[PDB]
Design a protein around this motif. Structure first.
Motif, mmCIF file in Angstrom:
data_model
loop_
_atom_site.group_PDB
_atom_site.id
_atom_site.type_symbol
_atom_site.label_atom_id
_atom_site.label_comp_id
_atom_site.label_asym_id
_atom_site.label_seq_id
_atom_site.Cartn_x
_atom_site.Cartn_y
_atom_site.Cartn_z
ATOM 1 N N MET A 5 40.382 27.099 -19.197
ATOM 2 C CA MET A 5 40.247 26.963 -17.754
ATOM 3 C C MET A 5 38.804 27.193 -17.330
ATOM 4 S SD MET A 5 43.732 28.437 -16.177
ATOM 5 C CE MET A 5 44.204 26.870 -15.455
ATOM 6 N N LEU A 13 42.609 24.526 -8.934
ATOM 7 C CA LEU A 13 43.849 25.281 -8.836
ATOM 8 C C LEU A 13 43.922 26.040 -7.522
ATOM 9 C CD1 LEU A 13 46.363 26.574 -10.366
ATOM 10 C CD2 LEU A 13 44.674 28.017 -11.444
ATOM 11 N N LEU A 17 46.505 25.879 -4.320
ATOM 12 C CA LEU A 17 47.266 27.014 -3.818
ATOM 13 C C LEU A 17 46.900 27.366 -2.382
ATOM 14 C CD1 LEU A 17 47.086 29.323 -6.941
ATOM 15 C CD2 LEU A 17 48.831 27.667 -6.367
ATOM 16 N N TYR A 21 49.831 27.311 0.343
ATOM 17 C CA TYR A 21 50.321 28.623 0.754
ATOM 18 C C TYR A 21 49.364 29.267 1.752
ATOM 19 C CZ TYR A 21 52.965 27.541 -3.372
ATOM 20 O OH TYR A 21 53.746 26.893 -4.288
ATOM 21 N N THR B 1353 47.215 22.074 -17.941
ATOM 22 C CA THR B 1353 46.814 22.405 -16.575
ATOM 23 C C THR B 1353 47.854 22.100 -15.495
ATOM 24 O OG1 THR B 1353 45.553 20.317 -16.412
ATOM 25 C CG2 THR B 1353 44.390 22.276 -17.176
ATOM 26 N N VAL B 1356 50.533 25.007 -16.214
ATOM 27 C CA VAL B 1356 49.996 26.277 -15.734
ATOM 28 C C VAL B 1356 49.953 26.338 -14.211
ATOM 29 C CG1 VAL B 1356 47.864 27.581 -15.580
ATOM 30 C CG2 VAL B 1356 48.724 26.881 -17.780
ATOM 31 N N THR B 1357 49.634 25.223 -13.551
ATOM 32 C CA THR B 1357 49.647 25.228 -12.093
ATOM 33 C C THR B 1357 51.051 25.447 -11.555
ATOM 34 O OG1 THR B 1357 47.727 23.767 -12.015
ATOM 35 C CG2 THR B 1357 49.081 23.932 -10.041
ATOM 36 N N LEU B 1360 51.893 29.196 -12.055
ATOM 37 C CA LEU B 1360 51.271 30.012 -11.022
ATOM 38 C C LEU B 1360 51.956 29.828 -9.676
ATOM 39 C CD1 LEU B 1360 47.670 29.635 -12.190
ATOM 40 C CD2 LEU B 1360 48.834 31.785 -11.923
ATOM 41 N N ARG B 1361 52.342 28.600 -9.341
ATOM 42 C CA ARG B 1361 53.123 28.391 -8.130
ATOM 43 C C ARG B 1361 54.444 29.148 -8.177
ATOM 44 N NH1 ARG B 1361 53.154 24.230 -4.566
ATOM 45 N NH2 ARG B 1361 51.120 23.276 -4.139
ATOM 46 N N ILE B 1364 53.596 32.597 -7.229
ATOM 47 C CA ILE B 1364 53.177 32.713 -5.838
ATOM 48 C C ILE B 1364 54.349 32.555 -4.878
ATOM 49 C CG2 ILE B 1364 51.766 31.720 -4.038
ATOM 50 C CD1 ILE B 1364 50.254 33.264 -6.222
ATOM 51 N N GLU B 1365 55.367 31.784 -5.254
ATOM 52 C CA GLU B 1365 56.458 31.441 -4.345
ATOM 53 C C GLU B 1365 57.525 32.527 -4.296
ATOM 54 O OE1 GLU B 1365 57.368 27.745 -6.151
ATOM 55 O OE2 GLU B 1365 55.621 26.876 -5.156
ATOM 56 N N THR B 1369 57.503 33.005 1.125
ATOM 57 C CA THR B 1369 56.496 31.959 1.072
ATOM 58 C C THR B 1369 57.139 30.638 0.687
ATOM 59 O OG1 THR B 1369 54.908 33.644 0.389
ATOM 60 C CG2 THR B 1369 54.287 31.345 0.103
#
Lengths: 177, 1429
Positions: A5, A13, A17, A21, B1353, B1356-1357, B1360-1361, B1364-1365, B1369
């Motif tokens: 990364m 990324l 986000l 959000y 990628t 991984v996104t 991460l979501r 976050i969720e 949210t």
């Protein structure tokens, strides 16, 4: 051996986000580094300040090639996400601070790369509450003062002035039409 | 030439250059590299001459020579760089290593001095002015980056040492001292006249170079024109520099014109021009310098080339002065050059006005000058049918180009009749009659001026015939030797198209046997350089093709010539036969260029025959017996061995194909077959073996050729090798004529190949094929380094004659290539013939081809063979040959060929070759053969090819469904069903004989995979063929699993074919067999896992090393090789059998064992990361993928269950969405029932017909596609074994294992599987929190590019979501999504119109769009949609 990364990917990324959000943009805006947190950090400074100063400006030695396009995407997303004024005000305040910092900076190609890249980010943001904030903060007047803080003989000076004229034309138009 | 004499003379040099290439330019580049580091004058002379050489490695030195104090060399360098930028873009294309340093020194010379407005006008810079009327800042330096010097005179000495002293006194920016040096040397110059003029001149050159490649300003043109007005006359070099600058500036033109005054007769430039011309003409008035006059006429050329300038040259009436020049100027080389310049200007001006020229009789003036110059040549070369000085030849050339252009121009159409009653034809007569004194392009221009005139006024052709200009052209183009060049050859037929035009001309043209002479060009080495492709990018024979298309146009204008043209074509062919037949010539790649002749003649004949596509030339040619001389060219003894692959053989094949496809004529094939039968009958000794311990006949014919240095170049030294390479050329022609898609040509081809002669040839070709496979494999056995033979004198007796190893090999290699390339062309021919046969005589063609297949499969060597490998290598290519001939690309058979392959034989021989290969002739039984230690080396390669053939032979989905079926109807009718019965019965036994034995060293996994594919096809097929021995397949499916798992231990990659075999045995048998399989696979996994669980107990006592051994024991134990396929098999089985295998994986508890194994391996992997020697157990990815698909399957079963709870099982209403009206319209009852039944079966797609339109539903997308239009429309189902899934204590352990495998970067594919599993697990935020509390985003950021994969990628996104969720949210984002989809009429891949207002807005469609959000969280999605919709 290269990191998987790169900062470019991390920026894309975060741009995603942020765009999804609401709270992430405010958390990124308010978050600030601490002294001696990394080799590149000299004193407590915001993430937006670091993105504007070290990642956004073109520099001749690569770390990741396309960090600036994606720091531009990141700051664009952090603007476009309405997030009321919590994210946008800290973005605008920090862009104004980094502009004034680079204008007070000593004459150098680092100065002209920072200046040109900040003009590019103001232009991309500009492409309405962001414009209200740029007016309230006097950003247009700090762009117009740009040549006061140049050596008008520099070989870079015309390129940084062109760059500062690019948002001035659009902004003066959007007001006075 | 005289250039070479001048080179030898120079190699006093500088005195000779003062009088006035590679190694002379290298001595020059020497002194260039020398002077810049009795010298300067040598450099100056080298430059002044080189500036002539370029006009018909130095750069880096010249750039340094710009750092000169004496401007003379800078000027000369600039003149050379101007000559460069003028002529070619050599300095424009250069790289920025020196293009920029050069162009910057030029910029620093060129940059302005302040012009008139600052008192630095060029006019004032050229007049002396006393040095006190210039601005006081002239003799002043002011160089900044800070240096200022008021005056340079009190230190006037040594300006170079001034610059070096300033280098020491100030730090001048590095690598930019040139702008200082040029200012300082300027300020020294300006004190005095010559140096000020030299700076002016250098600046003007630098400008001009910078424009041929900020400097220009409004006053520059006015300054230059005032330089031109200065009348001290000592400035002519500054005037010439100023004109050359204005020329560069043409490339502001209206300002140039306004200043110079060209818009009026009175005006400075026109007057200056007229004074130059008058001074050139009249001797009294002194003549303006040559350089200045040349700069004036170059400026006029470039100005005329632009419309504004041509209009100005009209306005001032310069045509009268230029015609004055072209009338009164003398004969000397410089005056000639000014005349040609004036002619080219009168050309540019006449491309837009004619009236001035005509009123001044300019055509008569031009013709008089052409008469005068031809009369001056007439003295040197008086011959006329009853070297030219280059400048006069260029005059004539430009003037004939003008006359040709004028003839093709109106404003002469009235009056051009009175050109050819002038003197003109009497002077053309001399150019045409002396094409060797005058150049060939001038002789061309003369014949093209006549051609264009005769096409403008064909009436006056009678006048040109009356004065015999046509009779001189004929003699010069036919009887006298044609000048050998592309353009001359390209024009002869258009010339003859003119000379024939009067009918009298036709008589005279045909009297002198024109084509016997014209076509000799194609057989003459003098014209081969004319025939060679230009630019290396136009076609082979492009110039003979042009010549042929022009002769075609000629004799389509004049059909009477057709018969004589085709007679001379046939005489060309008969002469090529002569040159190829007798021994005394030898083809060069006495040497003769025969292959080039054959390419050029064939491109000529092709063009002629195929130009009009009217089949009149083909018919005439065929009726004059030209096909014999054509087709004989393939068989020519003295053509080389590499001929058949050559473009000349492909050209002959193309001419034959053109004749076939135009005329629809069998005679090309008939004659090819006659000559091929003649050649095949000559080489029957190739079929007859040694009949002793002996090798190749080709090597016994070679070896017995005495000691001749090159036998292969003689048709008597190697008759069989040259008959081989003749047959090869014929075969490549039959290939080319079979590669034809016209059904009529296919029919007449097949009718010929089906003939008595066709089948005699095809039988002899089949025996040739088997002979060539034998000879090629023997030869390769002899070129092999004493490895394949068994220490035997099989062909050694003849290699002992031939002869330290390479000395024999390199003599055999022409044999090996001549025999292997012919075999491949025969195989291509037979494949094409099968294609033609399939799509009465076809049935005999197929008969002979299946007799070839039988012959190849049942061929047995002579009984002197030292090893079976010669038979196994014969068999391998016989099998690889029978595959293309029984089956098409896409693997469908030809049922005619399978019919004849069965009835004739070759099926019993195909399976006998398997029995022979395993038993070794009955030496060992077949059941022990495979495993026998002494099995031959090539028995795995043979079995790979045999199994790949039988896999095609057995498949019912192609053998029954083949497009190439016979029709339905005295002859025995074929059944592909009985063919599959006998084939599957014969194949099963051989597979039995290979089912469980251990695999071969190489060719064992392809053997295994094709054997498993055969078993799959048999097991699927017996259910379908018994419809129209069962207990043997039953007992097989019972005992097969020991073999399947042996294959999984030996050859893991077969597991996909073992899955497919198990699934077909299951779909034959019941769930009672599915359970037995799955429980047995699971027990294998169970024991393999529990031994690895016992393999990783922490090593307290240290008995084993506990570091390298333990870390790699987990990865390398045999059990760890088993799991990688037992789990993977179980996973593939799971993917098919979704729910039975899930229920077994649940009830066995194996999942707990796999979680425990994933947990227990983490200490091992971690310790390996600490050894810095991580080596990931490959079995980890099967386990992660199995768990992934276990929980995918359970999710889905619960969703399907609660979907069933809301449906009536009878007539579940399926409805299709009408976007235009917004209606969920129902299907018919039979369609609805079909769709429901096939959804309930779990089929991915269902086919149905409505209104005779074909609809298909795709349940992956739930879309109805109209199969005709491709319109995709949405569908819905109208609503009104419980797999527990992974428990919390498993998921917690899996999350920890995935984080530990991220900590140690286990492997790319294992990270992909573990992150996929994490993605499925973390969709519950509780587990996403666990995954983020174990610091996995740091590990993920630390991951290196060595540990990355395509999806990394994105995936991984998404992870991460998932972190976050959190419920809130996610709720707010789902609100955002629902609002967006309801407010915006979103498009889809279901033709829901973008920004539609019916379809895009229905709740029932929007819920289909929002489905991803419902899956992300259905409960939250309900809450949101209830609150926001």
């Amino acid at each position: 051996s290269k990191p998987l990364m790169p900062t470019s990917t991390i920026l894309r990324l975060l741009a995603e986000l942020v765009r999804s959000y609401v709270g992430i943009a405010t958390l990124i805006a308010n978050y600030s580094y601490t002294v001696g947190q990394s080799e590149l950090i000299k004193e407590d400074c915001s993430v937006l300040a670091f993105v504007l100063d070290h990642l956004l400006p073109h520099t001749q030695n690569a770390e990741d090639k396309d960090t600036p396009a994606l720091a531009r995407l990141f700051l664009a997303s952090l603007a476009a996400a309405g997030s009321g004024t919590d994210a946008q005000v800290a973005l605008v305040n920090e862009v104004k601070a980094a502009l004034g910092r680079a204008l007070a900076m000593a004459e150098s190609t680092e100065k002209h790369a920072r200046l040109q890249a900040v003009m590019c980010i103001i232009s991309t943001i500009m492409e309405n509450n962001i414009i209200r904030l740029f007016l309230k903060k006097g950003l247009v007047n700090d762009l117009a003062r740009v040549p006061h803080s140049l050596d008008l003989s520099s070989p870079n000076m015309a390129n940084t002035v062109n760059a500062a004229l690019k948002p001035l034309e659009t902004l003066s138009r959007i007001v006075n039409q | 030439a005289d250039c070479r004499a001048l080179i030898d003379k120079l190699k006093d040099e500088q005195l000779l250059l003062e009088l006035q290439w590679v190694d002379l330019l290298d001595r020059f580049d020497g002194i260039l590299a020398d002077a810049g580091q009795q010298l300067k004058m040598l450099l100056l002379a080298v430059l002044n001459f080189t500036a002539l050489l370029i006009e018909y490695s130095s750069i880096e030195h010249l750039t340094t020579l710009l750092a000169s104090s004496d401007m003379q060399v800078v000027l000369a360098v600039l003149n050379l760089l101007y000559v460069f930028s003028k002529r070619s873009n050599y300095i424009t294309r250069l790289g920025s290593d020196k293009r920029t340093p050069l162009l910057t020194r030029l910029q620093h010379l060129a940059e302005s001095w302040g012009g008139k407005e600052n008192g630095f006008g060029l006019a004032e810079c050229c007049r002396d002015l006393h040095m006190m009327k210039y601005p006081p800042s002239a003799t002043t330096l002011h160089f900044e980056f800070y240096i200022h010097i008021e005056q340079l005179d009190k230190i006037s000495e040594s300006p170079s040492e001034i610059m070096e002293s300033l280098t020491k006194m100030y730090s001048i920016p590095k690598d930019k001292q040139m702008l200082l040096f040029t200012h300082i040397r300027l300020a020294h110059g300006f004190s005095n006249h010559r140096k000020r003029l030299q700076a002016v001149q250098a600046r003007l050159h630098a400008i001009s170079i910078l424009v041929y490649s900020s400097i220009l300003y409004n006053g520059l043109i006015e300054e230059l024109v005032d330089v031109l007005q200065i009348t001290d006359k000592q400035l002519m070099e500054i005037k010439a520099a100023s004109l050359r600058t204005l020329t560069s500036i043409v490339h502001k033109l209206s300002s140039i014109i306004d200043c110079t005054g060209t818009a009026s007769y009175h005006g400075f430039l026109p007057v200056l021009v007229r004074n130059c011309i008058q001074a050139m003409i009249d001797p009294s008035m002194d003549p303006y310098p040559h350089q200045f006059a040349t700069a004036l006429f170059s400026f006029l050329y470039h100005l005329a080339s632009y419309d504004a300038g041509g209009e100005a040259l009209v306005s001032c009436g310069m045509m009268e002065a230029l015609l004055k020049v072209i009338k009164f100027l003398g004969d000397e080389q410089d005056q000639i050059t000014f005349v040609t310049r004036a002619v080219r200007v009168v050309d540019l001006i006449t491309n837009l006005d004619m009236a001035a020229f005509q009123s001044h009789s300019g055509l008569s003036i031009f013709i008089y000058r052409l008469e005068h110059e031809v009369d001056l040549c007439r003295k040197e070369c008086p011959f006329v049918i009853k070297q030219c000085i280059p400048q006069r030849a260029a005059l004539l050339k430009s003037m004939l180009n003008f006359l040709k252009k004028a003839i093709q121009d109106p404003a002469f159409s009235d009056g051009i009749r009175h050109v050819m009653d002038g003197s003109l034809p009497t002077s053309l007569k001399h150019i045409i009659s002396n094409a060797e004194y005058y150049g060939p392009s001038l002789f061309l221009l003369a014949t093209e001026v006549v051609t264009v005139f005769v096409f403008q006024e064909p009436s006056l052709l009678s006048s040109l015939q009356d004065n015999g200009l046509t009779d001189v052209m004929l003699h010069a183009l036919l009887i006298k030797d044609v000048p050998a060049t592309r353009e001359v050859l390209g024009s002869l037929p258009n010339v003859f198209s003119a000379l024939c035009l009067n009918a009298r001309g036709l008589q005279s043209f045909v009297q002198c046997q024109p084509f016997e002479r014209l076509f000799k060009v194609l057989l003459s080495p003098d014209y081969l350089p004319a025939m060679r492709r230009r630019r290396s990018s136009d076609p082979l024979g492009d110039t003979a093709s042009n010549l042929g298309s022009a002769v075609d146009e000629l004799m389509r204008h004049q059909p009477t010539l057709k018969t004589d043209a085709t007679t001379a074509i046939i005489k060309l062919l008969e002469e090529i036969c002569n040159l190829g037949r007798d021994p005394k010539y030898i083809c060069q790649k006495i040497p003769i260029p025969l292959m080039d002749y054959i390419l050029n003649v064939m491109k000529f004949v092709e063009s002629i025959l195929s130009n009009n596509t009217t089949d009149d030339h083909c018919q005439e040619f065929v009726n004059q017996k030209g096909l014999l001389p054509l087709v004989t060219i393939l068989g020519l003894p003295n053509l080389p061995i590499d001929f058949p692959t050559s473009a000349a053989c492909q050209a002959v094949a193309g001419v034959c194909k053109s004749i076939l496809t135009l005329s629809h004529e069998p005679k090309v094939l008939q004659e090819g077959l006659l000559q091929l039968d003649s050649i095949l009958s000559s080489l029957e000794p190739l079929h007859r073996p040694i009949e002793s311990p002996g090798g190749s006949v080709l090597l016994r014919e070679l070896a017995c050729a005495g000691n001749v240095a090159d036998a292969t170049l003689s048709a008597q030294a190697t008759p069989l090798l040259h008959a081989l390479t003749a047959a090869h050329a014929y075969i490549m022609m039959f290939v080319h004529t079979c590669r034809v898609g016209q059904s009529e040509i296919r029919s007449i081809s097949v009718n010929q190949w089906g003939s008595q002669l066709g089948l005699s040839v095809l039988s002899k070709l089949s025996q040739l094929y088997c002979s060539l496979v034998w000879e090629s494999t023997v030869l390769l056995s002899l070129c092999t380094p004493n490895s394949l033979p068994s220490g035997c004198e099989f062909g050694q007796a003849d290699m002992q004659k031939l002869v330290a190893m390479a000395a024999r090999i390199k003599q055999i290699k022409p044999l090996l290539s001549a025999s292997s390339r012919l075999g491949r062309a025969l195989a291509e021919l037979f494949g094409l013939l099968v294609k033609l046969c399939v799509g009465p005589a076809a049935r005999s063609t197929a008969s002979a081809l299946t007799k070839l297949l039988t012959k190849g499969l049942s061929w047995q060597p002579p009984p002197y063979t030292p090893t079976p490998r010669f038979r196994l290598t014969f068999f391998i290519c016989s099998v690889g040959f029978t595959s293309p001939m029984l089956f098409d690309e896409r693997k469908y058979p030809y049922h005619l060929m399978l019919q004849k392959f069965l009835c004739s034989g070759g099926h019993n021989a195909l399976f006998e070759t398997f029995n022979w290969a395993l038993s070794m002739g009955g030496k060992v039984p077949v059941s022990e053969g495979l495993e026998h230690s002494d099995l031959p080396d090539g028995t795995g390669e043979f079995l790979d090819a045999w199994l790949m053939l039988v896999e095609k032979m057995v498949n019912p989905t192609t053998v029954l469904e083949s497009p190439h079926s016979l029709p339905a109807k005295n002859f025995p009718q074929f059944s592909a069903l009985r063919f599959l019965v006998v084939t599957q019965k014969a194949a099963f036994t051989c597979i039995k004989n290979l089912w469980n034995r251990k695999p071969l060293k190489v060719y064992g996994g392809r053997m295994a995979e094709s054997m498993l594919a055969i078993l799959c096809h048999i097991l699927r097929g017996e259910p379908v063929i018994r419809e129209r021995e069962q207990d043997e397949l039953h007992t097989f499916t019972d005992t097969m699993l020991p073999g399947c798992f042996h294959l999984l231990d030996e050859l893991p990659d077969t597991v996909y074919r073992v899955c497919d075999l198990i699934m077909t045995a299951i779909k034959r048998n019941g769930a009672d067999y599915r359970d037995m399989i799955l429980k047995q696979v699971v027990n294998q996994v169970w024991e393999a896992a529990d031994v690895l669980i016992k393999a990783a107990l922490p090593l307290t006592t240290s008995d084993t090393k506990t570091v390298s051994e333990w870390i790699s024991q987990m990865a390398t134990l045999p059990q760890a090789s088993n799991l990688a396929t037992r789990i993977l098999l179980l996973t593939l089985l799971f993917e098919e059998l979704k729910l039975p295998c899930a229920w077994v994986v649940e009830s066995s508890g194996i999942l707990n064992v796999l979680i425990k194994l994933l947990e227990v391996v983490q200490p091992c992997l971690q310790a390996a990361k600490e050894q810095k020697e991580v080596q990931t157990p490959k079995w980890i990815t099967p386990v992660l993928l199995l768990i992934d698909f276990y929980e995918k399957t359970a999710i889905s079963s619960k969703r399907r269950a609660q979907m069933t709870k809301y449906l009536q099982s009878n007539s579940n209403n399926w409805r299709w969405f009408d976007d235009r009206s917004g209606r969920w319209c129902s299907y018919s009852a039979s369609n609805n029932s079909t769709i429901d039944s096939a959804w309930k079966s779990g089929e991915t797609s269902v086919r149905f017909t409505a209104g005779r339109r074909r609809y298909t539903v795709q349940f992956t997308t739930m879309v109805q596609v109209n199969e005709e239009t491709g319109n995709r429309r949405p569908v819905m189902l109208t609503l009104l074994i419980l797999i527990q899934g992974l428990t919390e204590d498993m998921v917690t352990v899996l999350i920890r294992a995935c984080v530990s495998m991220l900590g140690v970067p286990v492997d790319p594919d294992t990270l992909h599987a573990t992150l996929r599993l994490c993605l499925r697990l973390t969709r519950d935020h509780k587990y996403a929190m666990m995954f983020a509390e174990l610091k996995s985003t740091r590990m993920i950021l630390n991951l290196t590019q060595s540990s990355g994969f395509n999806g990394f990628t994105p995936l991984v996104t998404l992870l991460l979501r998932h972190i976050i969720e959190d419920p809130c949210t996610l709720r707010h984002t789902m609100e955002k999504v629902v609002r967006s989809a309801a407010t915006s009429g979103a498009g889809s891949t279901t033709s829901g119109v973008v920004s539609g207002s019916l379809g895009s807005r229905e709740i029932n469609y929007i819920l289909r769009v929002l489905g991803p959000a419902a899956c992300r969280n259905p409960d939250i999605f309900t809450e949101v949609a209830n609150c926001c919709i």
